[PDB]
Amino acid sequence: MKQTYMIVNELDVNKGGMTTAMLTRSKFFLDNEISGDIITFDFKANYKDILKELVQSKKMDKRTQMHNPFIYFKNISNLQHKKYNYTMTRNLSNLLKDSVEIKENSRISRFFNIMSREYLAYKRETEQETIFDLFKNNLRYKRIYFYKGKIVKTEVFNSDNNLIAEQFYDDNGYLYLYRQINPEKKSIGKTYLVCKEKQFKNNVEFCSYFLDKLIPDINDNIIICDGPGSFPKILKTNHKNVKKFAVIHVNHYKNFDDTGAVKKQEDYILRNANKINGVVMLTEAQKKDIIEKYKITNAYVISNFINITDDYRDKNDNKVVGHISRLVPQKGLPYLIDVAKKVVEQDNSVEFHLYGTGEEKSKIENLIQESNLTNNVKLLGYTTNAIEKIKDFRCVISTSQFEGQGLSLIEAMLLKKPVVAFDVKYGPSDFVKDGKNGYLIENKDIKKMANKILKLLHDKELSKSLGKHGRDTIIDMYQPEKLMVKWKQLFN
Ligand SMILES: O=c1ccn([C@@H]2O[C@H](COP(=O)(O)OP(=O)(O)O[C@H]3O[C@H](CO)[C@@H](O)[C@H](O)[C@H]3O)[C@@H](O)[C@H]2O)c(=O)[nH]1
Ligand SMILES: [Cl-]
Ligand SMILES: [Cl-]
Ligand SMILES: [Cl-]
Numbered sequence: 001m002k003q004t005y006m007i008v009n010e011l012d013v014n015k016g017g018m019t020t021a022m023l024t025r026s027k028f029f030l031d032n033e034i035s036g037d038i039i040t041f042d043f044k045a046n047y048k049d050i051l052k053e054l055v056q057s058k059k060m061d062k063r064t065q066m067h068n069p070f071i072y073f074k075n076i077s078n079l080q081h082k083k084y085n086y087t088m089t090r091n092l093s094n095l096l097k098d099s100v101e102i103k104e105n106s107r108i109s110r111f112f113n114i115m116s117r118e119y120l121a122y123k124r125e126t127e128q129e130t131i132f133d134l135f136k137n138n139l140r141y142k143r144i145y146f147y148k149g150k151i152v153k154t155e156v157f158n159s160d161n162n163l164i165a166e167q168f169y170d171d172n173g174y175l176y177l178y179r180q181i182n183p184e185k186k187s188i189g190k191t192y193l194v195c196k197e198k199q200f201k202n203n204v205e206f207c208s209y210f211l212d213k214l215i216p217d218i219n220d221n222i223i224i225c226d227g228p229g230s231f232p233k234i235l236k237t238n239h240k241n242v243k244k245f246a247v248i249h250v251n252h253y254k255n256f257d258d259t260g261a262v263k264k265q266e267d268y269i270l271r272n273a274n275k276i277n278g279v280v281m282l283t284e285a286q287k288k289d290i291i292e293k294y295k296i297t298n299a300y301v302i303s304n305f306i307n308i309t310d311d312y313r314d315k316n317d318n319k320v321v322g323h324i325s326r327l328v329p330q331k332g333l334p335y336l337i338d339v340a341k342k343v344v345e346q347d348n349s350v351e352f353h354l355y356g357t358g359e360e361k362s363k364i365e366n367l368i369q370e371s372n373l374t375n376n377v378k379l380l381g382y383t384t385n386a387i388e389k390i391k392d393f394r395c396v397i398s399t400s401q402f403e404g405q406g407l408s409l410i411e412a413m414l415l416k417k418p419v420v421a422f423d424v425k426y427g428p429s430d431f432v433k434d435g436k437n438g439y440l441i442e443n444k445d446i447k448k449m450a451n452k453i454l455k456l457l458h459d460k461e462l463s464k465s466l467g468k469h470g471r472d473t474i475i476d477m478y479q480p481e482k483l484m485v486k487w488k489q490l491f492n
Contacts (some may be wrong), residue, residue, distance in 0.1 A: 034171030077176035228265035327358030332399035403427035413470030437470035
């Protein structure tokens with residue numbers, strides 16, 4: 001009878017620990033007769049394809065539904081008409097009627113009005129989608145998106161080519177939602193729902209109204225806010241009976257800031273703890289630090305659910321050091337390159353395999369090239385198949401400067417790999433047993449990390465022994481039954 005709604009701004013196929021944690025939690029809840037649905041707030045025309053890939057890749061349970069305002073309001077708008085209305089496409093065809101089409105590239109064409117002596121449009125055509133950029137006085141004023149043969153969205157641009165408005169279209173070709181965009185700030189302003197003839201001040205109010213419509217106001221319905229950016233949307237609903245929880249997935253302290261300052265999003269959640277049923281943390285240490293500053297009484301520790309990988313045959317014969325993460329400053333990748341430089345100096349056979357995507361790619365590439373590590377350190381992009389890549393790693397490392405819990409470290413340990421990790425707040429000190437399943441290193445100590453990496457690369461038997469203890473440690477600490485009991489207590 002308990003229904004859960006796990007809230008994050010968006011879902012995609014190239015995401016990190018938070019999305020993994022949520023999808024795993026949904027699967028375990030569903031095995032315990034508790035519905036675990038995801039709610040997102042962003043527009044993706046291809047959301048069907050993302051969800052299919054997440055299910056077929058075994059990341060997402062087939063029973064885990066995703067609710068989303070664009071999907072919900074489109075399905076309602078679709079009921080209002082029987083036949084497709086071609087007014088928009090006719091308006092475009094009429095605009096370009098006089099215009100001659102000239103191919104610029106393989107996919108790009110331009111429309112020139114011979115009469116007016118002016119270029120009115122650019123068109124880019126792909127397999128599934130066609131984009132039109134419309135121009136007046138050599139300035140773009142609108143973009144039209146065709147997907148699967150129909151207009152799904154239009155965008156309006158000012159004279160600075162900044163987005164000032166977005167319009168969304170139903171499966172019958174009708175406008176059902178439009179919003180103003182602040183051109184410089186790129187923030188969402190007034191939002192208009194065409195069906196209800198209803199106006200909202202901003203995206204928070206619109207998304208809070210969506211939650212009011214989607215979730216019945218009963219105590220057997222639970223909102224779990226995972227995305228810290230989404231917390232204002234769950235706080236500002238008119239629900240009086242629904243249970244509301246916030247999960248803190250990461251160190252709340254300002255990144256690379258020793259002042260004791262706390263991040264704005266996490267500070268907002270923690271200051272408003274009294275307005276919700278509970279704040280869930282992943283470690284006792286994080287709960288302790290939060291209780292000290294915020295004097296919260298509804299704080300709870302529940303570890304992330306973990307997917308126990310199946311025991312496998314280790315065909316290990318390669319000295320590869322593995323690292324799988326979002327390429328973000330949090331992960332201390334410059335410290336990793338420093339460790340790699342020392343390890344490569346004493347063993348040229350050592351490869352460092354870095355899997356993931358992010359802003360830091362160009363910086364790390366420069367560091368690899370600068371230290372002549374192009375042979376030894378390789379950025380291999382995002383993998384939907386992390387398990388297979390880990391199986392061929394000798395050891396996995398973390399240079400991370402902060403965590404909520406090391407899910408990539410846990411994943412490696414479950415696949416019987418030894419781990420070497422900087423001892424950072426709300427991170428690996430819970431599950432890394434220094435000398436038994438891997439090594440806990442003083443933060444930013446390059447030499448100590450490098451030495452233990454070399455010790456493991458030079459001693460396969462020790463590596464295998466530490467690895468088996470790691471798998472056993474994770475199975476013992478993060479038994480799904482214990483976590484299910486903790487969640488069920490919160491729900492009652
Ligand atoms: O190419 C890649 C790169 C990453 N991942 C996955 O991304 C996740 C990484 O999670 P984690 O190591 O925990 O890092 P974050 O993405 O930073 O996770 C955040 O959210 C998690 C959920 O609570 C917390 O455990 C972390 O501490 C917190 O930083 C893992 O499941 C990886 O398998 C891939 O699948 N492929
Ligand atoms: Cl094509
Ligand atoms: Cl203007
Ligand atoms: Cl602005």
